[PDB]
Amino acid sequence: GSSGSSGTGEKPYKCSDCGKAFTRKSGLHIHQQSHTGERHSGPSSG
Numbered sequence: 924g925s926s927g928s929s930g931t932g933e934k935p936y937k938c939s940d941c942g943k944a945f946t947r948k949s950g951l952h953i954h955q956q957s958h959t960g961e962r963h964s965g966p967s968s969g
């Protein structure tokens with residue numbers, strides 16, 4: 924079967940956007956908040 928028990932590292936979470944492995948579920952969540960990018964329909968540039 925496929926359960927893991929292979930990856931030595933301790934990053935149970937990986938950003939499926941860029942490719943960054945995080946050890947803490949949060950370390951990633953907070954990182955993702957940045958990916959969302961700052962945009963606002965209009966002349967607003969970031």
Ligand SMILES: [Zn+2]
Binds near residue numbers: 938939940941943
């Ligand atoms: Zn990312």
